[PDB]
Amino acid sequence: AALVIDNGSGMCKAGFAGDDAPRAVFPSIVGRPRHQGIMVGMGQKDSYVGDEAQSKRGILTLRYPIEHGIVTNWDDMEKIWHHTFYNELRVAPEEHPVLLTEAPMNPKSNREKMTQIMFETFNVPAFYVSIQAVLSLYSSGRTTGIVLDSGDGVTHVVPIYAGFSLPHAILRIDLAGRDLTDYLMKILSERGYSFSTTAEREIVRDIKEKLCYVALDFEQEMQTAAQSSSIEKSYELPDGQVITIGNERFRAPEALFHPSVLGLESAGIDQTTYNSIMKCDVDVRKELYGNIVMSGGTTMFPGIAERMQKEITALAPSSMKVKIIAPPERKYSVWIGGSILASLTTFQQMWISKQEYDESGPSIV
Amino acid sequence: TALVCDNGSGLVKAGFAGDDAPRAVFPSIVGRPRHQGVMVGMGQKDSYVGDEAQSKRGILTLKYPIEGIITNWDDMEKIWHHTFYNELRVAPEEHPTLLTEAPLNPKANREKMTQIMFETFNVPAMYVAIQAVLSLYASGRTTGIVLDSGDGVTHNVPIYEGYALPHAIMRLDLAGRDLTDYLMKILTERGYSFVTTAEREIVRDIKEKLCYVALDFENEMATAASSSSLEKSYELPDGQVITIGNERFRCPETLFQPSFIGMESAGIHETTYNSIMKCDIDIRKDLYANNVMSGGTTMYPGIADRMQKEITALAPSTMKIKIIAPPERKYSVWIGGSILASLSTFQQMWITKQEYDEAGPSIV
Amino acid sequence: ALVCDNGSGLVKAGFAGDDAPRAVFPSIVGRPRHQGVMVGMGQKDSYVGDEAQSKRGILTLKYPIEGIITNWDDMEKIWHHTFYNELRVAPEEHPTLLTEAPLNPKANREKMTQIMFETFNVPAMYVAIQAVLSLYASGRTTGIVLDSGDGVTHNVPIYEGYALPHAIMRLDLAGRDLTDYLMKILTERGYSFVTTAEREIVRDIKEKLCYVALDFENEMATAASSSSLEKSYELPDGQVITIGNERFRCPETLFQPSFIGMESAGIHETTYNSIMKCDIDIRKDLYANNVMSGGTTMYPGIADRMQKEITALAPSTMKIKIIAPPERKYSVWIGGSILASLSTFQQMWITKQEYDE
């Protein structure tokens, strides 16, 4: 059996080939103690990965190697994996084939470097790197799909025609679940809240994930909150103190369609779907309009699939089969893309072998 | 003095007669507000215009009024209503204005161009002029086929006796926008970000700065894949020094083999042979010898050496190939206007405010 | 005309014409242990500035101004103390300018407009945002400000004589917290400073010893290596302090609020963060012209260090310039007096008749 580790800008996702749910779902953080000690409590282990590092904000300095799918730092990424093998998945890398994810439009040098580390500091028998949305497309039951990922870091739209991604339309807004929380932290503080700590960033993250939704129309909904507390939803903080969130609740996800609310003056995910599809050829486009597949955690907000269905019905040809297929499991579909792909008896011949690596080297990827 | 304005979807350039270099230059774009949005310092403006529309895009969405050819008039009017006012600080009522059109510009839209100029503007005299004729004029040539290439436009125009043969003009829609989106595939496939419209604004520039054609396709395919020469570093306007390489040949080679996107059009060398092959036989002599190029997308280093070879391969070897490349070229249609507006014999050629009154739009 | 600069700690007043502020005093008022009514007998007004510090009440020491004026009675009281106590003039005769904090409530201005014309009977009043003025002392209409008086630091963007609210970053730090940090650290070398009289000694020490070292880490090491940063200061009574690492620990607080224990980002983080909130193109003039004002920009080194961090935070092609005047501490008044003297543009001076209406 093989291994699959989705290296997410917020949450990394490890496991084996064949399983349905990701075996090690964890924050992609490496944490290093600011002054390293002799003992327990004091800050003893040279780097901490996942939720331990995160609890231990008192002792550590927290670092995320992967920003917008682009792995920026390889010393933190590697040291994650030393822990993904020996501490998370509780395996020995040299025994199991590995599939790791990479962004839609991810660096060749970053690919070629990941290629290096895996067969080398980890000696894994076999490896393959795979483009995030294309793997969501595999978990969507397709060969053809305009797939739109929004993870914690990156938000990429891809026209998959017959398994081939068409790069000449692969689009993006650098706006995702992390930028989304920061918006809600602002607009609660502007409601009058003091939310400032990273702990209260997790408060503002939780509120985002549970109470934030995408209005079917933005302006209408605003005055709907103005006229009714319908929208207003209570929240029990770790204080026990109940707060109330109101028109914030739909303003926060609406970054994704109206990005410019953060000051991030891009076109919205609606617009970028359309603009990906036009940059394709016309028969591709037909099935892209019918095979708009959503992916990521930030694709989860209430109303988003219906809203995308609304907007793209107007933006696409009136007589077209517009069809969103929003995955229920979409915070993980990229790992479910990996695990199926690794388990594919066909795909067994598509792995990078240890042989081709030692005869040809990292440049074959 | 007269006023002269080269309207492109990329850049609109203005000024007066007599000056050698364009007085106004701006992107052709306005923004109409997705919310009521006081840019604290101005009042509630209708439209932020050009290098203003994109400055504040978060409030107000970018459109291009004229994709080489006029579509939307509410944006369009704000562009003629930028250039006089903000850009030149001049009043329309005072100044005989000349405006351009990308070659093969149609009946209906020009009628209404002429209308608006005499009504909401009141200009004392106006003249629209066919971009590629003005290029050849600015060149100092009587005759010869011309090739405009731009962000939205490309054009082959056989000029004789100061006159374009209209029927034989080819527009190529595969222009510099297509090219910048293509570069924007490829760097992104190498792994850079480059795909928001902000990063289009960057990836336009990088191309303009570093992207060349090279004389042979197969041999350059060899160098690209094998040698560390292709790479040039570049700070984009955040700070990330990237490295562009290969694409520098693998983008503008689309003007020669348009198939690179999957658009299948004949390459410029083909279109030019065939545009001259929309003209006679021995009369073709110094069309082949006075072949002038124009516009934005003619800046690419390598194209001329390439094109001469590729047009000669297509053609009966005795035709004297002489293709001219000025260094000012984004402005050649402005400098075809200003000096030709200053030229005395032209006072009679303008469309006056009076003649408009009697003739209506129908004088354009 | 007059110019009367108001804030959470210090108030500067004088005339239009003069180069240097005539009166500069603490915004402290006292309010009684509850004898009397708001309209009734007894000193509501009580004691402002030094007279209130000297004794401290009872007449409880309500500072009214947190940049934003929280309660308007105490401001009235100060403004009495200005025209009548500090200047000793006639308010009816002398048109007054007053200096407001960017992001003041518009309603807060209405009340400023009223108390002036009603209780003080001033013939005309003007009111101007402390930031643009801070630039008018440096001769500019446009630019990014880092004001850092005694109360709250201020990262204010300016286009063409106007502030842009959406970027105006506050940091709850300056001058005062800067001395009350210095008190905690002098304690480590025996000198537990405690009284207000001692806080006046300690504040002289801030000006004399405490300085924005260009870098924090190379500096720490030099302190730990060698005494050259250490410098003795004689206390007025007869004693002598010696201070080393601490000397730069005390101004570093602007760049690191974790020192005091505040959840808020250092001035380098906020300056930049305000300019990102600026218009993608106007940003260039602002970066090109950063102007920095206040008692807490008086710290030596601050301009180069700001410039170092903003260069390390802005793109490679970003033309940045920081600007601090040698008179920087007062600049809102110097900027103000120039404006208040601008006798041609005059109709800005909204009169009593332009108020009878």
Side-chain angles (χ1 to χ4, degrees):
Chain A
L3 298 175
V4 183
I5 314 164
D6 182 48
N7 296 297
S9 289
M11 291 299 264
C12 184
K13 279 81 67 203
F16 290 38
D19 308 284
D20 51 1
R23 291 190 184 231
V25 188
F26 61 103
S28 203
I29 319 175
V30 167
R32 289 182 166 98
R34 302 172 212 117
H35 297 72
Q36 310 199 150
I38 309 171
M39 287 177 84
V40 295
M42 303 303 267
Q44 54 178 330
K45 311 173 195 175
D46 303 271
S47 43
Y48 305 64
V49 176
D51 307 77
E52 190 183 11
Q54 177 67 276
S55 46
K56 286 181 173 178
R57 293 186 302 257
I59 43 177
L60 314 186
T61 292
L62 300 185
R63 286 175 162 273
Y64 302 68
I66 309 155
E67 300 154 53
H68 319 97
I70 312 304
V71 187
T72 42
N73 177 22
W74 282 105
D75 277 283
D76 289 355
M77 202 61 256
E78 192 192 289
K79 294 170 197 56
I80 288 183
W81 301 328
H82 191 89
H83 169 303
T84 311
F85 299 125
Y86 297 120
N87 302 319
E88 299 290 13
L89 294 177
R90 290 178 287 163
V91 291
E94 59 276 20
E95 281 293 320
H96 291 271
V98 176
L99 178 45
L100 292 176
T101 55
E102 69 160 52
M105 306 294 233
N106 168 86
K108 282 192 66 224
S109 39
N110 284 2
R111 190 178 296 145
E112 301 184 66
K113 183 62 194 167
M114 196 188 279
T115 315
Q116 198 196 2
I117 295 178
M118 287 264 96
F119 292 101
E120 291 173 18
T121 336
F122 295 118
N123 209 209
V124 304
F127 173 53
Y128 199 74
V129 214
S130 283
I131 292 176
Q132 290 162 36
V134 179
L135 297 180
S136 301
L137 172 110
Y138 293 132
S139 309
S140 77
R142 265 103 178 139
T143 48
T144 299
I146 182 86
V147 184
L148 167 54
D149 211 340
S150 188
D152 194 81
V154 76
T155 306
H156 277 117
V157 198
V158 183
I160 304 159
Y161 188 51
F164 186 53
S165 45
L166 297 173
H168 69 282
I170 297 178
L171 291 180
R172 192 187 89 262
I173 311 172
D174 305 73
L175 178 73
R178 181 201 89 277
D179 313 73
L180 278 270
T181 285
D182 299 316
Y183 193 59
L184 190 65
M185 198 161 103
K186 183 217 178 209
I187 62 176
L188 290 174
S189 290
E190 297 174 342
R191 178 181 167 107
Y193 287 110
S194 197
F195 288 135
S196 45
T197 59
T198 319
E200 296 164 321
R201 204 182 178 283
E202 303 308 291
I203 297 175
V204 179
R205 183 171 60 103
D206 191 66
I207 300 172
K208 188 194 71 202
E209 288 181 66
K210 294 170 189 147
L211 299 177
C212 298
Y213 63 154
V214 192
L216 194 63
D217 180 0
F218 188 50
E219 292 63 41
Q220 184 191 346
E221 196 63 61
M222 283 297 276
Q223 303 110 46
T224 278
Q227 63 186 241
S228 191
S229 290
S230 243
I231 307 309
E232 290 175 9
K233 281 269 187 161
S234 329
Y235 181 73
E236 199 184 293
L237 294 172
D239 198 83
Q241 193 185 348
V242 180
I243 57 173
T244 309
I245 322 298
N247 71 33
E248 300 62 58
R249 288 176 59 235
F250 52 87
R251 289 185 291 121
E254 192 62 60
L256 294 172
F257 300 77
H258 290 145
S260 45
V261 294
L262 286 78
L264 191 65
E265 329 169 298
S266 190
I269 59 172
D270 40 6
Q271 197 57 233
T272 40
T273 287
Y274 174 70
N275 282 180
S276 188
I277 295 175
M278 293 305 271
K279 277 217 281 274
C280 297
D281 190 299
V282 188
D283 355 63
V284 180
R285 298 183 185 154
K286 184 183 181 174
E287 286 189 284
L288 298 180
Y289 289 136
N291 292 283
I292 313 173
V293 178
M294 299 294 268
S295 58
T298 315
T299 60
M300 291 282 268
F301 300 122
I304 197 169
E306 297 64 33
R307 176 74 185 265
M308 281 295 277
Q309 193 66 43
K310 175 213 172 197
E311 303 298 343
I312 307 301
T313 292
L315 292 172
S318 21
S319 59
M320 189 57 83
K321 186 172 173 170
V322 181
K323 180 73 180 96
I324 315 303
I325 305 82
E329 73 309 305
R330 63 198 183 286
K331 311 189 81 175
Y332 295 142
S333 308
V334 189
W335 184 87
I336 303 173
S339 190
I340 296 174
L341 199 70
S343 310
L344 291 175
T345 44
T346 43
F347 184 83
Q348 296 321 287
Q349 270 70 245
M350 288 287 269
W351 295 110
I352 313 163
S353 69
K354 243 294 175 180
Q355 189 183 318
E356 299 161 297
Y357 190 74
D358 295 346
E359 62 204 1
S360 317
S363 20
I364 53 168
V365 70
Chain B
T1 326
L3 203 295
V4 284
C5 182
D6 183 47
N7 290 280
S9 46
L11 298 171
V12 180
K13 308 82 183 173
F16 288 83
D19 316 289
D20 311 276
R23 301 271 278 266
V25 280
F26 55 101
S28 179
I29 188 163
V30 316
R32 274 184 159 81
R34 49 69 85 70
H35 277 136
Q36 210 69 2
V38 287
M39 196 304 273
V40 184
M42 291 297 264
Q44 204 72 244
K45 291 175 80 236
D46 59 300
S47 302
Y48 286 50
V49 55
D51 196 309
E52 216 211 323
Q54 70 173 29
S55 99
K56 193 194 160 83
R57 186 194 308 136
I59 297 299
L60 31 85
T61 298
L62 310 182
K63 293 185 187 171
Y64 289 81
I66 40 169
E67 293 157 22
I69 297 172
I70 317 168
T71 56
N72 177 29
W73 294 96
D74 280 52
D75 304 340
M76 231 296 106
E77 193 181 297
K78 195 65 176 196
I79 281 175
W80 302 325
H81 216 77
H82 182 45
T83 189
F84 288 102
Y85 285 78
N86 304 147
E87 297 297 322
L88 275 304
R89 63 216 59 78
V90 298
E93 311 73 86
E94 277 292 326
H95 297 333
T97 308
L98 187 155
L99 297 172
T100 61
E101 47 193 21
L104 202 64
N105 177 48
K107 66 298 159 205
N109 63 6
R110 69 168 63 257
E111 295 283 292
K112 194 176 168 187
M113 177 185 248
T114 295
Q115 174 151 32
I116 290 182
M117 270 284 130
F118 293 103
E119 286 166 16
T120 50
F121 291 98
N122 302 149
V123 299
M126 201 282 278
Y127 187 85
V128 208
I130 311 172
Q131 284 170 345
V133 184
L134 296 184
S135 301
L136 193 90
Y137 270 124
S139 101
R141 269 149 204 73
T142 190
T143 286
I145 177 180
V146 180
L147 179 70
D148 196 25
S149 72
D151 177 71
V153 285
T154 307
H155 289 86
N156 310 72
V157 179
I159 304 163
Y160 185 54
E161 287 196 85
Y163 275 99
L165 299 174
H167 74 284
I169 298 175
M170 297 296 118
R171 58 169 289 209
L172 183 62
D173 296 47
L174 184 136
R177 191 166 292 222
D178 310 69
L179 267 54
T180 256
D181 284 45
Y182 195 55
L183 197 75
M184 168 168 117
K185 166 188 187 288
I186 316 166
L187 276 62
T188 331
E189 75 194 344
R190 287 198 189 251
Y192 302 125
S193 289
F194 289 114
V195 299
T196 64
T197 55
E199 299 164 303
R200 172 180 287 108
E201 285 287 290
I202 321 306
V203 86
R204 171 178 44 78
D205 175 67
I206 319 172
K207 187 188 76 282
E208 297 185 86
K209 304 289 219 297
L210 287 321
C211 298
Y212 66 105
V213 180
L215 66 307
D216 189 74
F217 178 56
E218 303 172 16
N219 288 169
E220 205 71 32
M221 284 292 268
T223 44
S226 303
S227 308
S228 315
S229 305
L230 281 289
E231 296 70 14
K232 293 301 156 201
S233 185
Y234 174 74
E235 175 227 298
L236 65 143
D238 70 305
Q240 182 168 72
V241 287
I242 59 158
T243 316
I244 185 176
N246 162 121
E247 283 67 81
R248 304 196 303 100
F249 167 71
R250 196 202 174 180
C251 181
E253 194 67 10
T254 302
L255 296 172
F256 291 88
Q257 289 163 106
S259 49
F260 273 40
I261 307 174
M263 289 171 86
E264 290 186 86
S265 40
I268 54 174
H269 54 286
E270 293 141 79
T271 66
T272 318
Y273 168 72
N274 308 133
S275 188
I276 309 168
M277 276 282 272
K278 300 293 179 176
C279 298
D280 285 50
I281 309 171
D282 202 87
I283 300 174
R284 297 177 180 151
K285 290 297 207 298
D286 91 299
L287 281 66
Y288 278 115
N290 270 321
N291 201 173
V292 174
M293 300 191 283
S294 0
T297 297
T298 323
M299 298 304 256
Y300 301 138
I303 59 171
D305 318 344
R306 186 62 186 273
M307 183 74 146
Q308 181 182 352
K309 170 166 62 80
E310 302 304 351
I311 194 176
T312 215
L314 296 169
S317 314
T318 44
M319 71 284 119
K320 205 288 152 196
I321 304 296
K322 199 184 97 286
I323 305 172
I324 302 84
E328 50 275 5
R329 274 181 288 99
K330 282 173 160 177
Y331 306 140
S332 304
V333 47
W334 191 86
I335 63 170
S338 63
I339 308 304
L340 180 272
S342 314
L343 184 64
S344 49
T345 44
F346 198 75
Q347 61 157 201
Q348 303 127 174
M349 297 299 280
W350 298 92
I351 299 168
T352 66
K353 196 210 157 288
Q354 169 176 339
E355 290 172 301
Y356 175 78
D357 297 349
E358 52 180 271
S362 26
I363 191 172
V364 61
Chain C
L2 300 172
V3 189
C4 192
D5 182 50
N6 286 121
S8 5
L10 288 76
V11 178
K12 348 297 169 298
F15 289 74
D18 313 288
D19 301 282
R22 290 194 182 213
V24 180
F25 68 101
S27 186
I28 345 289
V29 181
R31 297 218 67 97
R33 292 307 79 227
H34 304 154
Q35 315 304 1
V37 192
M38 207 61 93
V39 55
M41 61 180 271
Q43 296 307 327
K44 313 81 161 294
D45 284 54
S46 304
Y47 274 83
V48 184
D50 300 86
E51 56 186 69
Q53 297 177 325
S54 175
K55 44 210 200 71
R56 51 202 169 79
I58 300 180
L59 309 169
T60 331
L61 295 192
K62 280 180 62 238
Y63 307 87
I65 313 170
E66 303 165 322
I68 313 306
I69 296 158
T70 186
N71 83 117
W72 284 83
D73 295 323
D74 296 335
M75 275 302 276
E76 177 192 6
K77 292 153 195 43
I78 295 157
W79 298 324
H80 179 288
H81 194 85
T82 58
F83 312 136
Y84 293 86
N85 291 131
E86 291 306 308
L87 299 170
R88 297 160 308 290
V89 292
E92 60 268 53
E93 180 211 332
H94 292 277
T96 316
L97 165 59
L98 299 166
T99 57
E100 73 158 55
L103 290 168
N104 201 23
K106 314 305 171 289
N108 256 11
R109 187 176 302 141
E110 302 303 311
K111 203 153 179 70
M112 186 182 265
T113 289
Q114 69 96 176
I115 302 172
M116 254 53 236
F117 280 123
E118 296 165 30
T119 65
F120 300 112
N121 292 252
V122 301
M125 71 157 280
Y126 200 60
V127 58
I129 46 182
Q130 289 169 293
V132 192
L133 300 177
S134 292
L135 310 170
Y136 291 149
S138 75
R140 68 209 83 212
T141 326
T142 294
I144 172 76
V145 186
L146 176 57
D147 202 346
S148 288
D150 193 57
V152 270
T153 49
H154 279 83
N155 299 281
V156 189
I158 313 294
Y159 204 44
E160 296 178 297
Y162 222 134
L164 298 172
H166 69 266
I168 301 174
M169 289 301 114
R170 173 186 169 142
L171 170 65
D172 259 289
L173 250 171
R176 65 152 60 80
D177 312 281
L178 269 276
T179 300
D180 304 355
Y181 184 76
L182 178 59
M183 296 179 102
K184 309 295 191 293
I185 54 77
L186 290 165
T187 305
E188 300 167 352
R189 298 171 175 247
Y191 344 106
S192 165
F193 286 105
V194 62
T195 72
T196 322
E198 290 158 73
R199 189 196 157 149
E200 306 303 280
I201 302 172
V202 178
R203 195 182 60 244
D204 184 68
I205 299 169
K206 80 178 265 111
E207 303 184 354
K208 307 287 164 58
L209 294 309
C210 305
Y211 65 119
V212 177
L214 188 60
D215 181 85
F216 190 53
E217 296 172 68
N218 292 263
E219 196 69 358
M220 288 288 262
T222 307
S225 67
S226 57
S227 173
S228 47
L229 302 318
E230 293 198 291
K231 286 165 186 73
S232 298
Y233 166 78
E234 284 199 7
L235 304 182
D237 46 45
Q239 300 166 107
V240 59
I241 62 161
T242 317
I243 181 176
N245 202 316
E246 305 103 347
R247 292 163 53 77
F248 48 90
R249 289 167 92 195
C250 301
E252 169 65 54
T253 53
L254 288 313
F255 310 86
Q256 276 186 94
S258 312
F259 276 28
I260 43 281
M262 286 171 61
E263 299 66 70
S264 237
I267 54 171
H268 66 124
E269 297 156 78
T270 54
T271 44
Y272 178 74
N273 283 345
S274 180
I275 317 167
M276 294 309 268
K277 315 276 196 179
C278 265
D279 181 308
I280 192 173
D281 287 304
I282 75 171
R283 288 180 191 168
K284 287 79 174 191
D285 300 301
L286 312 185
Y287 273 115
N289 273 289
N290 308 242
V291 180
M292 296 170 62
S293 287
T296 312
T297 65
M298 288 193 89
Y299 280 118
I302 196 68
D304 216 285
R305 198 183 173 183
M306 244 302 111
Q307 189 70 39
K308 182 185 73 90
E309 298 154 357
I310 300 303
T311 309
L313 292 169
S316 175
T317 45
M318 188 49 80
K319 206 287 279 172
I320 303 149
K321 199 189 174 295
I322 274 70
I323 309 286
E327 59 290 343
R328 72 199 98 129
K329 189 189 180 82
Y330 293 128
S331 69
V332 185
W333 197 88
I334 281 65
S337 47
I338 298 171
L339 184 66
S341 302
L342 289 174
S343 302
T344 54
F345 303 107
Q346 63 165 208
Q347 51 56 76
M348 304 175 108
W349 290 90
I350 51 171
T351 63
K352 180 61 197 167
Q353 205 175 36
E354 299 157 39
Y355 185 69
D356 300 317
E357 290 188 292

